[PDB]
Design an enzyme around this catalytic site. Structure first.
Site, PDB file in Angstrom:
ATOM      1  N   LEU A  14       0.832  -1.200   0.000  1.00  0.00           N
ATOM      2  CA  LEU A  14       0.000   0.000   0.000  1.00  0.00           C
ATOM      3  C   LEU A  14       0.864   1.246   0.000  1.00  0.00           C
ATOM      4  O   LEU A  14       0.544   2.252  -0.607  1.00  0.00           O
ATOM      5  CB  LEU A  14      -0.851   0.069   1.257  1.00  0.00           C
ATOM      6  CG  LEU A  14      -1.901  -1.019   1.359  1.00  0.00           C
ATOM      7  CD1 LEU A  14      -2.531  -1.028   2.767  1.00  0.00           C
ATOM      8  CD2 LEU A  14      -2.956  -0.766   0.270  1.00  0.00           C
ATOM      9  N   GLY A  15       1.973   1.158   0.698  1.00  0.00           N
ATOM     10  CA  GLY A  15       2.842   2.286   0.820  1.00  0.00           C
ATOM     11  C   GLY A  15       4.266   1.862   0.717  1.00  0.00           C
ATOM     12  O   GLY A  15       4.668   0.731   1.012  1.00  0.00           O
ATOM     13  N   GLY A  17       7.747   3.021   2.068  1.00  0.00           N
ATOM     14  CA  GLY A  17       8.297   3.934   3.019  1.00  0.00           C
ATOM     15  C   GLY A  17       9.785   3.783   2.897  1.00  0.00           C
ATOM     16  O   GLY A  17      10.223   3.043   2.017  1.00  0.00           O
ATOM     17  N   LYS A  18      10.572   4.445   3.751  1.00  0.00           N
ATOM     18  CA  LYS A  18      12.039   4.311   3.675  1.00  0.00           C
ATOM     19  C   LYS A  18      12.609   3.545   4.860  1.00  0.00           C
ATOM     20  O   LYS A  18      13.809   3.506   5.026  1.00  0.00           O
ATOM     21  CB  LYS A  18      12.702   5.704   3.510  1.00  0.00           C
ATOM     22  CG  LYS A  18      12.184   6.487   2.279  1.00  0.00           C
ATOM     23  CD  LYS A  18      13.238   7.096   1.366  1.00  0.00           C
ATOM     24  CE  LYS A  18      12.532   7.554   0.103  1.00  0.00           C
ATOM     25  NZ  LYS A  18      13.374   8.236  -0.931  1.00  0.00           N
ATOM     26  N   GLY A  20      10.646   0.731   5.632  1.00  0.00           N
ATOM     27  CA  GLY A  20       9.923  -0.472   5.275  1.00  0.00           C
ATOM     28  C   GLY A  20       8.634  -0.143   4.532  1.00  0.00           C
ATOM     29  O   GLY A  20       8.293   1.012   4.347  1.00  0.00           O
ATOM     30  N   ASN A  21       7.889  -1.164   4.144  1.00  0.00           N
ATOM     31  CA  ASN A  21       6.671  -0.939   3.408  1.00  0.00           C
ATOM     32  C   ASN A  21       5.439  -1.233   4.228  1.00  0.00           C
ATOM     33  O   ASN A  21       5.533  -1.782   5.319  1.00  0.00           O
ATOM     34  CB  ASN A  21       6.695  -1.833   2.203  1.00  0.00           C
ATOM     35  CG  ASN A  21       8.058  -1.911   1.597  1.00  0.00           C
ATOM     36  OD1 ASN A  21       8.550  -0.947   0.997  1.00  0.00           O
ATOM     37  ND2 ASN A  21       8.710  -3.067   1.783  1.00  0.00           N
ATOM     38  N   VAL A  22       4.292  -0.836   3.700  1.00  0.00           N
ATOM     39  CA  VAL A  22       3.022  -1.117   4.356  1.00  0.00           C
ATOM     40  C   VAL A  22       2.301  -1.982   3.345  1.00  0.00           C
ATOM     41  O   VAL A  22       2.355  -1.705   2.136  1.00  0.00           O
ATOM     42  CB  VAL A  22       2.178   0.134   4.589  1.00  0.00           C
ATOM     43  CG1 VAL A  22       0.905  -0.240   5.322  1.00  0.00           C
ATOM     44  CG2 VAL A  22       2.918   1.098   5.412  1.00  0.00           C
ATOM     45  N   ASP A 131       1.574  17.791  14.281  1.00  0.00           N
ATOM     46  CA  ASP A 131       1.888  17.795  12.862  1.00  0.00           C
ATOM     47  C   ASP A 131       0.652  17.525  12.060  1.00  0.00           C
ATOM     48  O   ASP A 131       0.648  16.722  11.140  1.00  0.00           O
ATOM     49  CB  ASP A 131       2.982  16.764  12.518  1.00  0.00           C
ATOM     50  CG  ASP A 131       3.592  16.996  11.130  1.00  0.00           C
ATOM     51  OD1 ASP A 131       3.490  18.120  10.587  1.00  0.00           O
ATOM     52  OD2 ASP A 131       4.212  16.058  10.596  1.00  0.00           O
TER      53      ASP A 131
END
Lengths: 270, 43
Positions: A14-15, A17-18, A20-22, A131
Site C-alpha cells: 500500500l505504501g 516507506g524508507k 519499510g513498506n506497508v 503535525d
C-alpha cells in the site's frame, strides 16, 4: 500467545516507506483485513530512531477513537518489526485534495468535526499531535478522517514544550519565535488545515522560508473571495497569534458553520 | 495479487467489515505484545 508474519496473507503493498513498506494484509484466523507496516530493525538502529519509534508506538497503540487510525497490536522477528494497523480503504487524504484541488464546505466541515473530536480525545490524555496536515490523514470506508501519523506527537503531562517541529506552512507563531508551546499548537494547525481544505493552498504560502515565517508571525491571513463568512469565521478564530485566544476544540465542534455543513457519520461499533 | 485483495472481492469484504465490525479490542487487544523495550532485541 502472539503474532507472526505467517499469521497473515499478504495482499499487496500500500505504501512505500524508507524504513519499510506497508501492505494490505488479511489476518488468517479471522479473515480480517488490515494493514501491516514492516520496519527493518538494522535500518532503524543505524539511523538512530529506536527511541522515536518506541514513542510513536506507545502513543498510537493506546488511542482508541473512530477518527484515529488504530494500531491493533505489533510483533517482531529476527529482522523486522510489524505494526498491525487499521486499513483506511479510501487512502491518503492529501491525494484526494490534490485530485479535487479544493474541498467543498460539506466535505471540509465534516473533516473538521472529525479532526476536532480526535484531537480533543488526544488532548484529554495530554497527547499533543504537533503535525496536523493533509499528508498525515487517511480516509475510512465512508470517507471518515483518520489521523494516521504521530511522528511528532508527545505525551506532555506537565512541562510546556520547546521542540521546533511540524511542517513549515503549518508552524504556529510560538514555535517560530522560540517560545515554549503547549497543546494549543494543534488548534493553530487545525485552522491552517481548514483553510487549505477550502482553498487548496496553505494560508501563508511564500517563495521563501523566511517570508513564510514572517507571514505566520504577523498572521498575514488573506481570505480568497469565494470563502463563506462561516468558514472564515472558524478559520479566523483558530488562527490567533495568542495561543490562549484560539477557539477550543469543543468550540470547533460546536461552531455554527461546522454544525450547518458537517455530515459526519460514526462508524458501526462491535 | 491474491483474488481477495483486489477489485470486487476486496470491496465486498471491506463493506462487510464496516457493517459487521469484530471485537478488535478482544481479538487483538487481548493478545500479548512484545515489550517495547524488547523490540530491537532477540526475537
Amino acid at each position: 500467545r502472539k503474532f507472526t508474519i505467517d499469521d497473515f496473507d499478504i495482499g499487496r503493498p500500500l505504501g512505500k516507506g524508507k524504513f519499510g513498506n506497508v501492505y494490505l494484509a488479511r489476518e488468517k484466523q479471522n479473515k480480517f483485513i488490515m494493514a501491516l507496516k514492516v520496519l527493518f530493525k538494522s535500518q532503524l538502529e543505524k539511523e538512530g530512531v529506536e527511541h522515536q519509534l518506541r514513542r510513536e508506538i506507545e502513543i498510537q497503540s493506546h488511542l482508541r477513537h473512530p477518527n484515529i487510525l488504530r494500531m491493533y497490536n505489533y510483533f517482531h522477528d529476527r529482522k523486522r518489526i510489524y505494526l498491525m494497523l487499521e486499513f483506511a480503504p479510501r487512502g491518503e487524504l492529501y491525494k484526494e485534495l490534490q485530485k479535487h484541488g479544493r474541498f467543498d464546505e460539506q466535505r471540509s466541515a465534516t473533516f473538521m468535526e472529525e479532526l476536532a473530536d480526535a484531537l480533543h480525545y488526544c488532548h484529554e490524555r495530554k497527547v499533543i499531535h504537533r503535525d496536523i496536515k493533509p499528508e498525515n490523514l487517511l480516509m475510512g470506508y465512508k470517507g471518515e478522517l483518520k489521523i494516521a501519523d504521530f511522528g511528532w506527537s508527545v505525551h506532555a503531562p506537565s512541562l510546556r514544550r520547546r521542540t521546533m517541529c511540524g511542517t513549515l506552512d503549518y508552524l504556529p507563531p510560538e514555535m517560530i519565535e522560540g517560545k515554549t508551546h503547549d497543546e494549543k499548537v494543534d488548534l493553530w494547525c487545525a485552522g491552517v488545515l481548514c483553510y487549505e481544505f477550502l482553498v487548496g493552498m496553505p494560508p501563508f504560502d511564500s517563495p521563501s522560508h523566511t517570508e513564510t515565517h514572517r507571514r505566520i508571525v504577523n498572521v498575514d491571513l488573506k481570505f480568497p473571495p469565494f470563502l463563506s463568512d462561516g468558514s472564515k469565521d472558524l478559520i479566523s478564530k483558530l488562527l490567533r497569534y495568542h495561543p490562549p485566544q484560539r477557539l477550543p476544540l469543543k468550540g470547533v465542534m460546536e461552531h455554527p458553520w461546522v454544525k450547518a455543513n458537517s455530515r459526519r457519520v460514526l462508524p458501526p461499533v462491535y | 495479487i491474491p483474488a481477495w485483495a483486489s477489485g470486487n472481492l476486496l470491496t465486498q469484504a471491506i463493506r462487510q467489515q464496516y457493517y459487521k465490525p469484530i471485537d478488535v479490542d478482544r481479538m487483538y487487544g487481548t493478545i500479548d505484545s512484545p515489550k517495547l523495550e524488547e523490540l530491537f532485541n532477540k526475537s
